[PDB]
Each structure stands twice: as structure tokens, then as C-alpha cells.
Amino acid sequence: GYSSTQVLVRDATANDSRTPSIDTLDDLAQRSYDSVDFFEIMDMLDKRLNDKGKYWRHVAKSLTVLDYLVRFGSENCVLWCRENFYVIKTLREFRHEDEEGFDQGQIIRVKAKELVSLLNDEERLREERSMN
Ligand SMILES: [Cl-]
């Protein structure tokens, strides 16, 4: 019941130890230029960026994807971040301490802050996107 693109975003953001690979990130960035794929990718990222707690890997990996898209995918990816800027900004405050006491949330907060900073700096983002 998944499109090819939906399988790819699901895998890229799964609750597992794998980090999204460069090949997958590039595939997603290239596919983001096709409108139908763009919406499928962003709808799944929306779901996963809004996860929490024990499922923080969904959030962290979706931020990894979203940053890659902002840098290398279609301009629509940037527009999406601006429309949904509130969600990204709240991730700066994401918390989760695991059973063994480790702060797993800090990685999400740092990533969110970096992305907020990039989105807030139009000239830097335009330059980054141009060289990419
Ligand atoms: Cl398909």
C-alpha cells in the first residue's frame, strides 16, 4: 500500500540504529522535485517529526532528512519548513532521557537549533543551496 517514495522515507526514518545513508538522502532530495513525491515525503516527515519519548529516533532521523532536503531538495522543502516553522522551533525543546539516564533529546534540540538558524538566514541558505 506504500508508493516507492513512501517506502524510502519510512526506511530512512525507521526506529533503528541505521543512520540515513547518503544514497537514500540523495534519492529523497531528487524525488522532492516531483510534486506527488514531495507531498508524500513531507506528510511522512510531518508524522515522524511529531513523535516523542522512546520513539525519538523517528524525530532525529526526520530532522536529518529535513535538513538534507532544505539544502539539496526542491525549494518547496524550504517553503514547507516555513509554513511548519512552529513545529521545528518546538523541537529545540524536545526532551527524552532513556532508562539508563542518557539524554537522547539533546541531539534533537541541537539539530533543530541548527536548522532554525539556517532557515532564519536567507542569504546563507540561498548560497548553500546554490553551491549544492
Ligand atoms: Cl510508486
Swiss-Prot record:
Protein name: Epsin-2
Regions that span the bilayer: none
Subcellular location: Cytoplasm; Membrane
Family stated for the protein in its record: Belongs to the epsin family.
Comment field (misc): Present with 1970 molecules/cell in log phase SD medium.
General function of this protein: Binds to membranes enriched in phosphatidylinositol 3,5-bisphosphate (PtdIns(3,5)P2) and phosphatidylinositol 4,5-bisphosphate (PtdIns(4,5)P2). Required for endocytosis and localization of actin.
Region of the whole protein represented: 15 to 146 of 613
Residue ranges of domain ENTH in the record: 1-129
PTM section of the record: Phosphorylated by PRK1.
